[PDB]
Design a protein around this nucleic acid. Sequence first.
DNA 1: CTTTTTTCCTAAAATGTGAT
DNA 2: CTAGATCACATTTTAGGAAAAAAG
DNA 3: CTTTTTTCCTAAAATGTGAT
DNA 4: CTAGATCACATTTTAGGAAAAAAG
Lengths: 72, 66, 66, 72, 201, 201
Amino acid sequence: DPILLRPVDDLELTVRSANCLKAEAIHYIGDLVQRTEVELLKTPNLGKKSLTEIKDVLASRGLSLGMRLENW
Amino acid sequence: DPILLRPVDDLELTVRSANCLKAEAIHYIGDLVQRTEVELLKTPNLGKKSLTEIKDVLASRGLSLG
Amino acid sequence: DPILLRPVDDLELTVRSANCLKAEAIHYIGDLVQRTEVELLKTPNLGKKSLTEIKDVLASRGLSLG
Amino acid sequence: DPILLRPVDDLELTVRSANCLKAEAIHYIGDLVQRTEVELLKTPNLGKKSLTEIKDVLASRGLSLGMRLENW
Amino acid sequence: PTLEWFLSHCHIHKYPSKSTLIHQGEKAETLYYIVKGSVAVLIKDEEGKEMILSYLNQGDFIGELGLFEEGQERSAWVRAKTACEVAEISYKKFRQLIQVNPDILMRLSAQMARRLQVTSEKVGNLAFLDVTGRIAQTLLNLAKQPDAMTHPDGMQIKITRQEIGQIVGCSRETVGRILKMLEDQNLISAHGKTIVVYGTR
Amino acid sequence: PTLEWFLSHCHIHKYPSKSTLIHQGEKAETLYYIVKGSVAVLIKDEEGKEMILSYLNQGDFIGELGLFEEGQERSAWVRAKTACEVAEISYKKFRQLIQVNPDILMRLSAQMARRLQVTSEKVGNLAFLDVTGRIAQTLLNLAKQPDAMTHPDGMQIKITRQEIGQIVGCSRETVGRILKMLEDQNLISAHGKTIVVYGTR
DNA sequence: CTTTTTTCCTAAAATGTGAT
DNA sequence: CTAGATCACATTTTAGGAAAAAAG
DNA sequence: CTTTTTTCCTAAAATGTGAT
DNA sequence: CTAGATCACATTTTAGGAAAAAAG
Ligand SMILES: Nc1ncnc2c1ncn2[C@@H]1O[C@@H]2COP(=O)(O)O[C@H]2[C@H]1O
Ligand SMILES: Nc1ncnc2c1ncn2[C@@H]1O[C@@H]2COP(=O)(O)O[C@H]2[C@H]1O
């Protein structure tokens, strides 16, 4: 799909969140998108607010978390 | 082993856990791996996410806690 | 007993059961009460409602079938 | 009630039916009305058609069968 | 009333006793309404053991569940309890009908309301009561039904033990047992398929 | 859409977690709609043993059953699963609302449709499956719910054994058992209230 | 004469049984 | 420890329709 | 300074146990 | 003969909120 192409930054999310996915090696919304909450929760300095954040932006952009898709 | 020579610090983790090990007198990844979970959990300001973190680094780092 | 003297006929029932008892040679309420249910059920043209009828008259008529 | 006063005949039902309730001692729709189907079925010469009849007329007149009511 | 209107738009078909009106699993595209007759809503399990979900008589709608969400499957089987006349309508045309008059929808939903209430109670029963309890309860319910017969000692009903089994959800033997038991306790009478639950009224 | 309209006519109240929105048995005169939050539909038995009938989240209507027939009682209790905002409307005013627009009724019924389907399936379960079976099934269902958490090995959910007890209708001990059992059979993971049903997705 | 009730009949379906 | 399921089959009961038999 | 994440803490709730 | 309920209680786990501690 077209969205998973552009990088995460396009999500215009909070610093904390960014710096977190950033340090967690997440680049494209295509990676994040297919990542499990439970995982992101282990991510240091990423808490409920930040997590709830990620979900909400993906939700607006029409996406879900822990997405499934082959070949990436 | 050669890695157990390197300092915990050289592991880079999280400020919180850092300061813990640090002021806990854990300078080399040796001193560290020597302790078990229960060992550090008793450390002030070191808890669930902390321990769980310290574990996951040594996870892909071929090192456990024992 | 005095009633067992009276004829079945004097009992007035239903045309069907009548003709049955009648052509079955049951003329006095005696001959009748002498038979049990199973006895008459074998009678041609005498069945469930019939038997059940013949019973209910002797019901309030203080007479059973035995 | 007013209806249970008038006699059964007012029900304008079939001969067979009439002659049956008649011979079964039923006078007022107040008696019939509170009579059980199972009973009426024992009534000689009163069959399903006739029974179904009784019910239907009582049903139209707004009444039921095997009615309940004290003092009659 | 409204109903006359509604029906005038339905196609009508007669289903002979024991026939299947709704076949669980099929594409639900039509709504049915029972003009004359009775029918039985039921579901089976893998092996095929049936479970009677509900009995619907005339005046009831059937296969309404498919109507709100496009392309679903019939929620359960519906077998003709007796021969019965049924009015049918494409869910499509029915929706149209509703626009001109929701009164009709009101009527339909109204039934689902009822049906939920009861089916819910059905759950609480399988949940809280025991076979004797459930069988006990059902004899009461069946006494409620229309085809019930007014009887001097209460209500009389015809239904097999196998049936009550599929209703209350237990074995047919066990029904026979709990049934004899209730007869001793002088609560019901039982002669073959004919049972009389005393106490009704 | 329409909903905005609908709500604009409702009164709004916040119910703190664990509070009771609907009290089974009371006169049903109002209709509710969940704006934010979750809630639990449940019924108890004589002794008081509860049985969870269903979980309703935001978007759901509650206490709709009273609406069609005048003067009935609430069909079951509804406890706030979490703190939640609820829109309320006199059944009266709601009916009026429907006249101006049945679209709304359509929406409501639509839910009952769903609710019947499931509650029906609930019956077939208590009917055909065994505790292991039912518990098995529910872990699947709970994995379906919104509050479910995406987990590497499937879906993760928090719920006590006592709870699953009241869901599937069996004892809490027995749930613990069948639960350990499913863990050996490596089908689910269980750490306290946190369970992970593998296989989802 | 026509209707309705009753009996009568049998392939098919329902039932009981009772210790493990 | 309790509440039901079970299982094969000989035996009992039912559905429902022809037709005799009363009734109108 | 302000937010969000983590640890830390305990009354209260959930749980296991295992033979009958 | 099988599938669950049971029962008291010592022991384990949870809810959820203050507050220390990082981060922005
Ligand atoms: N629990 C229930 N109670 C009553 N009727 C039901 C129940 N479940 C299903 N039905 C009816 O059976 C029908 C089966 O197909 P539908 O889903 O189209 O619609 C269903 C309802 O009409
Ligand atoms: N089986 C069910 N499934 C889902 N919700 C239900 C069920 N039974 C009752 N409810 C809800 O609980 C409410 C209780 O009160 P009401 O009867 O007003 O309306 C009921 C429904 O909103």
